[PDB]
């Protein structure tokens, strides 16, 4: 390998593991060109996004194929269907891999030579290789034992100038801080219980929300057992991780256990080997959303309330019927102690591989992979109406506006089952002829994927706190789902080679998929790559400065199929989605089926991605200075998609082949070693990435625009034919022909423009990492910065703190009456359009609305700049000197201190979130924004390693 003709990075296990992340990809965040890696939240157990060379799939499948040995590995993700009222993320298929079992990882970034893995490799490949048995001294036992702490990284910046109240006036029950400027006077607050009221000085408490959070804590233990002979090897490992996060109580929980046993034996020409792995996880998630969730409830606190003074439920004023506020929020401590959102998964995956060498040059390889999961979700909420409505202010006292309407309880349970089989039958042929070298490989691939689940839910809990399907007097709901997809393929890979100087590779592959129309199942795709190690023909001296000099170029295609069941019409059990609910059948005793709303097609042709790429790799002076640059031009074409259609056609979407989605880019890596004595070494690394997304055409028959994710009557993110993927549209203030913001003649507040404007896209303009590694004898010090700049992202965290009067921005003008600077009034009778200098102020009374709506930007204000610079990871490691390990059973000892996600610095416009959050998953729709996702976290820990 490294006769490759396209961009590829290789990382060693030691680096993967040194960060001591529970996950294998998240320690690589910001460290590889072209490989964008984010975590959906700092919530223990959450998913990780890995995106290679931008989004090509509009239908939400952009992660690289993970390939463990080399059996493709399930990468499914479990996250909330409804990010708005119940957001939660329970993890990602790859998060199962034990970091300690990784020997090498190699990210294939080119989509031009994928015949060895078929379609799913167009998104990239993460080739993992696991440690095997090795003869060492003495016993073969490595133990790793870690301990880590979480702390909140960044809370929004609050004003501390105005307390509880609204309109500028003091109240005793607000969820916000539009009251008067703090006096230090004593003023009643909260509901009244037993004809008694709480009464405290009216002053800010700027750490109330910060004090709320605990310190996260996590311990881990991994053991491995290792050994080999000249004929065989054997490796067995066990890992274990227990995290309870930053959020008070057990609600934020992740427990992982893995067990692995890999082994091989060679006998004559034949080698057989096997790898079997079991993975168990147990997640608990403190749900996000706009309802009665912890964080929403927590940010809607007046700046003068002591949030930790609310935990003691033996103080009646914190019980739900007397909690100081009634406005769509509850005591955060009650939510986390009495709601339930839990997940458990058991997983088995494995490989069997048999190699047979025959007739000098040939090798036969059979490889079989299995991957099966069963996971179980359990969610409950109490029957707040039965517990607290009658006789309480919050309460019967609020009528139809109480938070308890109609919170009558709910409990559901889902069991999902996934199963993937992969089969590879290959013969390989390798013969040197004179200086040339020939390697041919023809193979068969077969694959079958299957998911199913069954779902049951009861509402209105008889016993208000017990979470069981027996505990309802009303109808249950039951749902069941299965999909099944299959595929076989033949492929061939010819690589030629002259004098270890020219490398040439040809790949061809033809697939038949089950998800394409019967008369059009087969698709074919070739590739071609070239490598030229031109160092090998330099001067004798001139090649004393240039250690290595390679140039590479690839041109190739990768075909792709559709998601399951997109060809034929369907009739669904008839249901009507109305705002904030449904009206579904049966009614009343009658069942009914309705024509499904996505029109299908038997016209569809296969997807086809075409990519060109050139790259250059050079190293100088002992490999003391090194760079790699690559330029790619990739076109995903005819991808099968449910494209929005005018419902008056009778369908809301039609399945067709789109046009081209292009990503072009530069990938630049640069390393150097300013100092390399024998006891000291200093290395510097700089990687740089720029991708340019452009949708080139969406079928114009249906418009040239389809929503990817959007709020009804609010900020939506689209794919539009001329633009990058992820264009946001949002409401903007109307402006007259000379640029001044038109304002209502009576309120003073901005007037809406007739259309939404374009307001940015989801894409970073560039991304880069800078890192340095100090080695002195056996101390090491690593420091890695991650830099993402450009693009925009929706943030309810800003939306709610603006609406709340808590954001520092809202103490503008010291909340004195004000005229929007450079505002006008539009004066129009019938047809004559004229503009006049605005004279109307915005009252004290109405300042809350001005900010609640977003100032002069209106709703576009809650698009925030996704840019950050981050101290991603620091690791301080000390290998203990072998001489101190002589009277010991230990062959080696390394203690290690590390920190992750340590500081984040963002532009001035953004004082609210760490931009590395979402509530809509680890793929495309994730880029829409965060919906009061939990605050991201700062991690730091120790780790002790011991070899036996």
């Amino acid at each position: 390998e490294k006769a490759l003709g396209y961009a590829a990075t290789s990382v060693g296990g030691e680096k993967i593991a040194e960060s001591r992340t529970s996950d294998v990809m998240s320690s690589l965040a910001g460290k590889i060109a072209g490989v964008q890696i984010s975590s959906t939240s700092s919530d223990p157990g959450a998913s990780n996004s890995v995106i290679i060379r931008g989004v090509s799939s509009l239908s939400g499948t952009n992660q690289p194929l993970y390939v463990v040995d080399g059996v493709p590995l399930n990468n499914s993700t479990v996250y909330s269907t409804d990010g708005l009222n119940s957001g939660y993320d329970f993890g990602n298929g790859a998060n199962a891999i034990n970091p300690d079992d990784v020997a090498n990882m190699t990210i294939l970034k080119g989509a031009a030579a994928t015949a060895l893995y078929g379609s799913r490799a167009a998104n990239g490949v993460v080739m993992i290789t696991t440690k095997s048995g090795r003869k060492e001294k003495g016993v073969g036992i490595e133990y790793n034992g870690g301990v880590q702490w979480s702390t909140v990284l960044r809370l929004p910046e609050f004003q501390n100038e105005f307390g509880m109240g609204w309109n500028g006036n003091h109240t005793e029950l607000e969820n916000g801080s539009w009251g008067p400027r703090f006096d230090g006077s004593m003023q009643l607050w909260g509901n009244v219980y037993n004809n008694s009221q709480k009464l405290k000085p009216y002053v800010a408490m700027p750490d109330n929300i910060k004090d709320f959070f605990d310190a996260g804590f996590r311990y881990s233990n991994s053991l491995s057992f290792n050994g080999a002979t000249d004929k065989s090897d054997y490796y067995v490992s066990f890992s274990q991780i227990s995290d309870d996060g930053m959020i008070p109580t057990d609600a934020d929980s992740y427990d992982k256990y893995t067990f692995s046993a890999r082994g091989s034996h060679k006998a004559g020409a034949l080698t057989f080997s096997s790898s079997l792995n079991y993975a168990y996880q147990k997640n608990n998630f403190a749900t996000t959303g706009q309802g009665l969730s912890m964080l929403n409830s927590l940010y809607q606190t007046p700046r003068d309330i002591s949030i930790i003074g609310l935990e003691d439920q033996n103080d009646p004023f914190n019980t739900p019927g007397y909690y100081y506020t009634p406005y769509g929020v509850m005591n955060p401590y009650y939510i986390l102690n009495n709601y339930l959102n839990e997940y458990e998964s058991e997983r088995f995956y494995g490989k069997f591989q048999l190699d047979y060498e025959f007739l000098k040059y040939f090798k036969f390889t059979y490889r079989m992979g299995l991957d099966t999961t069963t996971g179980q979700s359990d969610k409950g909420k109490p029957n707040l109406y039965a517990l607290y409505y009658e006789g309480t202010p919050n309460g019967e006292g609020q009528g139809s506006s109480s938070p308890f309407s109609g919170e009558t309880g709910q409990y559901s349970e889902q069991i999902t089952r996934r199963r993937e089989i992969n089969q590879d039958i290959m013969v390989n042929f390798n013969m040197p002829v004179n200086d040339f070298n020939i390697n041919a490989l023809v193979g068969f691939n077969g694959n079958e994927r299957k998911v199913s689940y069954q779902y049951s839910e009861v509402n209105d809990l008889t016993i208000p706190t017990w979470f069981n399907l027996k505990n309802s007097g009303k109808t249950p709901i039951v749902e069941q789902h299965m999909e099944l997809r299959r595929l076989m393929g033949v492929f061939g890979q010819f690589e030629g080679s002259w004098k270890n100087m020219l490398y040439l590779t040809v790949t061809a592959r033809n697939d038949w998929s089950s998800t394409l129309p019967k008369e059009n199942r087969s698709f074919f795709y070739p590739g071609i790559t070239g490598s030229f190690i031109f160092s090998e023909l330099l001067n004798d001296n001139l090649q004393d400065v240039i250690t290595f000099g390679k140039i590479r170029a690839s041109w190739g295609k990768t075909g792709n199929d559709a998601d399951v069941y997109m060809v034929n019409p369907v009739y669904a059990q008839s249901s009507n989605r109305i705002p904030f609910g449904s009206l579904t059948f049966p009614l009343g005793g009658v069942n009914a089926y309705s024509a499904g709303n996505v029109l299908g097609s038997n016209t569809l042709s296969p997807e086809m991605t075409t990519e060109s790429e050139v790259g250059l790799n050079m190293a100088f002076f002992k490999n003391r200075l090194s760079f790699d640059v690559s330029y790619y031009n990739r076109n995903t074409d005819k991808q099968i998609f449910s494209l929005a259609m005018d419902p008056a056609s009778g369908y809301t979407a039609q399945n067709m082949n789109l046009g081209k989605i292009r990503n072009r880019g530069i990938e630049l890596l640069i390393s150097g070693t300013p100092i390399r004595t024998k006891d000291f070494s200093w290395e510097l690394t700089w990687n740089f990435t720029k991708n340019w997304s452009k949708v080139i055409s969406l079928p114009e028959e249906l418009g040239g625009i389809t929503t990817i994710y959007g709020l009804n009557g609010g900020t939506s993110m689209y794919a539009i034919t001329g633009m990058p993927v992820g264009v946001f549209k949002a409401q903007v203030a109307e402006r007259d022909p000379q640029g001044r913001i038109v304002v209502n003649s009576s309120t003073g507040l901005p007037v809406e423009a007739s259309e939404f404007g374009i307001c940015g896209d989801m894409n970073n303009k560039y991304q880069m990492g800078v890192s340095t590694n100090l080695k002195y004898k056996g101390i090491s010090l690593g420091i890695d910065f991650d830099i993402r700049q450009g693009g925009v992202m929706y943030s309810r965290t800003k939306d709610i703190n603006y609406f709340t009067g808590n954001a520092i921005q809202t103490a503008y003008n010291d909340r004195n009456p004000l005229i929007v600077p450079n505002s006008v009034n539009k004066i129009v009778n019938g047809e004559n359009v004229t503009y006049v200098e605005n004279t109307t102020p915005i009252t004290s009374s109405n300042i809350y609305k001005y900010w609640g709506d977003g100032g002069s930007d209106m709703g576009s204000c809650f698009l925030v700049d996704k840019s950050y610079v981050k101290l991603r990871s620091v690791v301080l490691g000390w290998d203990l000197p072998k001489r101190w390990l002589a009277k010991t059973p230990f062959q080696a000892v390394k203690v290690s201190a590390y920190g992750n996600n340590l500081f984040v610095w963002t532009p001035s416009s953004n004082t609210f979130i760490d931009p590395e959050m979402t509530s809509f998953g680890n793929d495309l729709e994730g880029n829409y924004g965060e919906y009061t996702a939990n605050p991201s976290s700062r991690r730091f820990g120790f780790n002790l390693m011991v070899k036996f």
Partner: peptide, 10 residues
């Protein structure tokens, strides 16, 4: 686009 949100209370 689809999904829907509520305003606050005050």
């Amino acid at each position: 686009g689809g999904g829907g949100g509520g305003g606050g209370g005050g």
